[PDB]
Amino acid sequence: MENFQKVEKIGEGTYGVVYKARNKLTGEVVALKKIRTEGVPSTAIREISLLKELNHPNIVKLLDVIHTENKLYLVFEFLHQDLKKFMDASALTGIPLPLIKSYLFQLLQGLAFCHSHRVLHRDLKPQNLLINTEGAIKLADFGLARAFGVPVRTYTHEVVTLWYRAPEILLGCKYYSTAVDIWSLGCIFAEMVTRRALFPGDSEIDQLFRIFRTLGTPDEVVWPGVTSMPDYKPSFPKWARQDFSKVVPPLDEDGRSLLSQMLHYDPNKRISAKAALAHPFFQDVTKPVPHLRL
Numbered sequence: 001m002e003n004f005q006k007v008e009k010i011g012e013g014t015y016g017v018v019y020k021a022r023n024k025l026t027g028e029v030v031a032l033k034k035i036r037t038e039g040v041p042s043t044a045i046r047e048i049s050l051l052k053e054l055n056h057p058n059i060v061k062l063l064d065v066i067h068t069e070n071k072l073y074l075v076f077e078f079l080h081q082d083l084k085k086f087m088d089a090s091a092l093t094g095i096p097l098p099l100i101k102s103y104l105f106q107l108l109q110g111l112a113f114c115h116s117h118r119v120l121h122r123d124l125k126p127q128n129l130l131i132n133t134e135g136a137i138k139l140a141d142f143g144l145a146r147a148f149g150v151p152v153r154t155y156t157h158e159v160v161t162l163w164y165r166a167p168e169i170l171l172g173c174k175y176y177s178t179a180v181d182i183w184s185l186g187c188i189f190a191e192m193v194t195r196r197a198l199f200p201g202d203s204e205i206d207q208l209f210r211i212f213r214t215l216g217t218p219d220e221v222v223w224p225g226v227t228s229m230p231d232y233k234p235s236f237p238k239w240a241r242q243d244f245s246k247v248v249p250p251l252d253e254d255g256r257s258l259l260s261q262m263l264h265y266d267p268n269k270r271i272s273a274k275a276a277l278a279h280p281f282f283q284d285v286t287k288p289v290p291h292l293r294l
């Protein structure tokens, strides 16, 4: 883009490539996301504007959309680090619980806001969560698989993480609900705590079976309707649920109780972002400042 000097390529998206870029007029530093070119739907750019009018301290601001010359550019505010990088950097000592807690609380606020506005993320993962020096965390790179839609790639030969995908998606449900984002955020919370991915599947079925081995193979008792879902097979192995205290030690009982509710199989039993904010886990929540090396 001639309006912009690329400083660097800071991420490889689901949709496209993200660049750190400077505006030659304003001198403002931004994140620039470029999307691959068929006639490049009209319908898409409509509901991108739905993302543009979202303003919340926990949602990364979308500054502009630019359709010119058969690529789509999304201009976003720039943040200095992503949670994936921060977790890797914190792997030795772990992220302090008060900071984990503030981050979870803020992400739930962000989700509560998005969801009350009928916007789903669908894509949540540590790479998509951005932090700053003042202790804020923000939802970014909304994946919307309507308002556009879903490829199997981003641009070139990049491998999509299934680790955060809700079981209803894996079982082939056509219609997502807001519950899919709470699932992903639950997986992220566990990972901050234990410093290991909770469900690191290497394929769709391995992802499913990893969830089953830990939470038990779902049945009609815990998840009415499950056996009727498009990708469900009666031939799935039957695993018993693991004791939950094995899962995220040493998280306290308030944390485990909240996590267990974010991880319910039935999208209808799964806690809402709004209700999650009222959980006793957050009674002592504060806003600590992260030690960030930029």
Ligand SMILES: CCN(CC)CCNC(=O)c1c(C)[nH]c(/C=C2\C(=O)Nc3ccc(F)cc32)c1C
Binding pocket: 010, 011, 012, 018, 031, 033, 060, 076, 077, 078, 079, 080, 081, 082, 084, 085, 127, 130, 140, 141, 142
């Ligand atoms: C392994 C961790 N990371 C993945 C490659 C490596 C490092 N990458 C980083 O730290 C990083 C930084 C410093 N900014 C972003 C991305 C965005 C940003 O700032 N505003 C946005 C608005 C929308 C959006 F969709 C992405 C961004 C990343 C991934």
